[PDB]
């Protein structure tokens, strides 16, 4: 026997939490189609955007990084309800 790290939580509760990821999985093509379409239009529009200060650009990148939600996060928490 050897010293081991203590695992927070009960075994069945952790397994139940892990089981909330086992949900119908959409195909990634649906997301990709929209991202490709809007991305092409976005690239066309970007050429006409006004020149922004580097500081403003960096701040916008920070805000976007903070506000980005990982696909797994929505997947785990999605509920088909009002």
């Amino acid at each position: 026997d050897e010293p081991k790290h203590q695992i927070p939580g009960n075994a069945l509760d952790n397994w139940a939490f892990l089981r909330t990821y086992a949900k119908p999985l959409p195909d990634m093509i649906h997301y990709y189609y929209y991202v490709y379409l809007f991305g092409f239009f976005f690239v066309y529009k970007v050429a006409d955007f006004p020149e922004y200060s580097p500081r403003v650009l960096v701040m916008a990148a920070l805000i976007g990084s903070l506000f980005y939600v990982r696909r797994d996060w929505v997947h785990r928490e999605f509920k088909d309800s009002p």
């Binding site: 690239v43 970007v46 050429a47 580097p54």
Partner: protein
């Protein structure tokens, strides 16, 4: 996957360089560099690590090619081809390790020369944001390549199929090791 992730690129780079198809926007290469590096670090599957490495690098290469550095992109594509050949056509652990190291950019291998050409081009344009992003993203990518090295020699016993069809694979590994000193003039 190997032949269509390398060969097609040369034609596009030639078209861009010769037909003056460059933009002032650096967002797309910066995005590719960061997305690719972070996605390479978070990817469980080894095919995804290799696929996202090409995204990151081709983003950086795109940034370098817009500024007129055609020679460096044509030398990079050739080194990248030789580096990717041995990792993709995996048969021997050693060949795959030398390939991963070359893609990573370790100095004893030809991959170092290829990465060096791009990094050297970046310092000439003198864009600070690109250089900072490049350093951090390269570190993140390096973690993924270390993961690949760990998987082969430090995780579990590895048994692979005996596909003894190393047409140009031995030559590519030799060209990666040996080629650094002849091509040192470029960088």
């Amino acid at each position: 996957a190997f032949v269509f992730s390398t060969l097609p690129k040369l034609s596009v780079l030639y078209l861009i360089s010769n037909s003056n198809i460059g933009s002032e926007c650096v967002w797309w290469g910066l995005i590719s560099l960061w997305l690719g590096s972070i996605s390479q670090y978070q990817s469980v599957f080894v095919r995804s690590i290799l696929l996202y490495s090409s995204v990151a690098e081709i983003g950086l290469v795109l940034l370098v090619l817009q500024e007129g550095f055609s020679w460096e992109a044509f030398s990079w594509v050739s080194i990248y081809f030789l580096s990717l050949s041995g990792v993709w056509h995996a048969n021997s652990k050693f060949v795959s390790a030398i390939s991963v190291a070359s893609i990573a950019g370790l100095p004893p291998f030809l991959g170092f020369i290829g990465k060096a050409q791009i990094l050297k081009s970046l310092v000439s344009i003198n864009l600070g944001i690109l250089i900072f992003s490049s350093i951090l993203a390269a570190t993140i990518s390096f973690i993924g390549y270390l993961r690949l090295i760990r998987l082969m020699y430090l995780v579990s016993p590895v048994k692979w199929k005996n596909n003894k069809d190393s047409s140009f694979i031995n030559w590519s590994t030799w060209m990666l090791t040996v080629g650094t000193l002849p091509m040192v003039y470029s960088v």
